[model samples]
Target: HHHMHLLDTLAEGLKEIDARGLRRRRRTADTPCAAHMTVDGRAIIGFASNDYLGLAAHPQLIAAIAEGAQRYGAGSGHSRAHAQLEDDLAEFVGGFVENARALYFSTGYMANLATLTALAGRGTTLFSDALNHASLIDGARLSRADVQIYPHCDTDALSAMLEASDADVKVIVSDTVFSMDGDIAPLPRLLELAEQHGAWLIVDDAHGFGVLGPQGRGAIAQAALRSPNLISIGTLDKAAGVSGAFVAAHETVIEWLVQRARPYIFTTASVPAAAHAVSASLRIIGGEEGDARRAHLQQLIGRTRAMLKATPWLPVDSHTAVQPLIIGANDATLEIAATLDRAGLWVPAIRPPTVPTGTSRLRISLSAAHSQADLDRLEAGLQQL
Candidate 1:
């Protein structure tokens, strides 16, 4: 076996990270993802989940999955291309988009990789936001496309690059809501740029969908910039409270994916029951249920922001569920996290790689699943820290 030095290399890196106080450890949750959960057997107010709508454990979702399994069976029985079940999911999800088709993948990562790699090839050029999720970066790398990263949220830089590009095709990609900083992207400007350049605009709305738009349709819908060239990718695991992901795009592209996207064609479909649960989530997200939930969640975000604004230790100006508290050094971030943990609050210390070096902070994520009392507890913990 080669040099058998894999462990040695990993151990060296681990030692360096530990020296920097940037090592990470897992904490198991012993309770359902509600306002309060058990972390290490201690009851803690959780503030780090992506279940922004608090629907992860909703009884309706549970019931829907059970009913879906009864009708659609448990698995795809094989890869999607070989299974008839994926056809049902695509059709059901397609009804939500205009002049578009939908396809399900086992995770957002696979969906993104399949879509970007399939749509753009070695001859194509992709302009990606510098702060996009790592999956997009990896997909772009694997596609062998000429990947150009524009400065984070700098639409002018993107425009300049697009103006100079002479590639056969240009695809612009960005995260609808930046995962770490909890900031919204300049999607409208990007959409305008895409239209001007005849480039395809791909939005990875993993964090924004089901939480931002009027009907929770996400960034594009919220901006009212839905067009034939605009493709939106959403995750069911987050606000949708299910598993897998879907791409909303013109029927032609979706059909192309069905035939050419390796991830979609090769992998076993997600549990049919999960698709059913997501279908239920889509109903609520596009209907009155989504409206009410988003309103409540937004109010929670506002209230949480207001409370944090009054805290001298916390930074301000976040418009979403993610609120970051900068702590300068990794050790300080970990200490703050630990202090809060000791106070029965669960907030993760987001360090390098997840965030840039020297920008370590606590990525406090709020959710509708949390009650006012939970926020109060969080505020109290921060105060103590």
Candidate 2:
């Protein structure tokens, strides 16, 4: 009775969220994320995670972490374990950036916030993609920099914006893969612009690391471009199938972040066991086993691309494992996702402000763990709708 008025105030605010079809919900995972999962109460085939290489539940990784906990005691401002992992990441992930160094963080969000805030401060101008991740935007806002958003993947517009910017310091930031939309940023063009405009380029490659490149060196390696002015941030929880993030750049940049990034300096380091586990994943991701997984995913992508083409709804032109089918209205997007739930496919509906208002969609995240049967079930579900 005492807190009734306070509760009522928030309840009324929730009404506005629900009214706009924007209320988010959660389902507890009773089983490991894989081709099949036990969520809430049902067993379902899920296309709803970022575990592209399907290494999340690998026996080797499980064993490695257990051993890691016993050996490292499950714990960094930067310990010996952190230092080893940092060296491994700099060598494994950066893919030939000259004199490269890597700094580890607890999460990709923290990595982005630290990278942006440390690099772009007061009076600096941050040119960003309109569809960049929220962390990047928040980082820019906190940096007290003049932030400018260019149209998504439109290099011409970005070029014009960069031309007009005369800030003593400039930074251009973009996601290597647009998370919700599943499209890639134009990296080569962005690099060209950054070079010409004398700006630092920050590419957040969360979705591409461990899934792209000849050995998953990521999009930068795939593009075959290396420069001191370029910096990359990658997530371990996605393709790496562990917990944490890393920012790989020139040694000077890494040193600067370690000195100035409040997020890095103030926050406790991630568990050492997880860092150990991520190192185990690196072997699987960069070895022959990873090649086989990426190959199988390519076949899956080919099949799913064609499957989406036959669907009634419009699909994004994405070559990556993240496939999205666009539905116009938010309610209709929810309706289809709910109906797919009945069909036992756990594809999630993405709506504003994750995506633009009119482009709400079903974000179907695929994994190498997904069998051909999973895709068949997904196709049948779409057909019935």
Candidate 3:
């Protein structure tokens, strides 16, 4: 009878979600994640992957992974570290500081959690952007810190909040590039605030690391800002086209995290092959090929913006590859997504609680692998709507 009641409760919750148009469904991929792939047995041009540099399917990366597997086997019984990837990542996003150290985690969420919960606690206060990723939010909550959410990119509001607070240790957390809206955070202003208030600024550059700045260093490098207090968090899975994440900070902070970050210490190590593959990925992101890919991606962004300008359902202001077409109601967004899917394009519909109410959108993620013709098809499909 208890099991029956539990099943009934779960069913009721699912029914409520379906009724509210917030039910999510996952489709199995029949091919590699790329510009064009097969999903649910249908061939489609996909704009739903985060493989910004298209390195996810690169031959070199695959070869590196296979080599690593042969050298280090499939898994690590203990947490293993990578030197080359860490050194390259630290040099790129570590504020050009001496003695910067990088620590890897199994996932970006774990990296965020380890950093926030380990760095700040009850005596500290966190000033977070309103639209930060869920990982940061959850990390702040778990840290037992006094969290003040400033309006998105509102430096004046953040200043006011900081002025009102009297916490001993102050930290500001924000996403370098917002995931859903496709906008960027104001890093310069935020860094200035951190300096003035004696706070630590942590930038999660998960989306920006391999797609923005010189040779894809990240948004901090793109903005030409440097500070001792600034720490950067990045993911290998996005543009690096592998798995895992890293936290780049001062040596002392890295050592402290090694000592205290439970998420880092307790979790089993990620596969060595993934880490080894990331070393090759970093090299690819630093070379001439990376520059070419970035240029081509920028061209795509420009073309997409120009093509969608005359449409009623235009995307939000975004300079990066992430473009969102806002559709107010959840059901309407899903319907539009279904329409696009039927037309042989794959763009996912994003709904609440991922976003605020009435802001459900189609998240159009562009890749360097996509051809102009593929983008043209997307434009035509949107026009048909």
List the candidates' TM-scores in order. Answer: 0.92, 0.97, 0.97
Could you give me the TM-score of model 2 versus the true structure? 0.97
Clashes of each: 0, 1, 0
Which residues of candidate 3, in runs, are more than 4 Å off?
A: 78-81, 263-266
> What is candidate 2's CA lDDT for residue 88?
93
Alpha-carbon lDDT, every model: 0.80, 0.88, 0.88
Supply candidate 1's per-residue lDDT for 171. Answer: 97
Model with the higher lDDT, candidate 1 or 2: 2
- For residues 1-385, what per-residue lDDT tens digits would candidate 3 score against the true structure? 3466688889999999999998888888898878889987889999998999999989999999899888888878642336566776777667645688888788888888888878898899999999998988988999898999999999999999999988899999999999998899999999999999999999999999889998999998899876778888999899999998999988988888888888534465568888899988888998899999999999999998776666787578899999898889999999999999989998999998999898899999999899899998998899898
Worst 10 residues of 2 by lDDT: 74-83
Clash-forming residue pairs, model 1: none
State the local distance difference test value for candidate 2.
0.88
Q: In terms of TM-score, how similar is model 1 to the real structure?
A: 0.92
lDDT of 2 at 139: 80
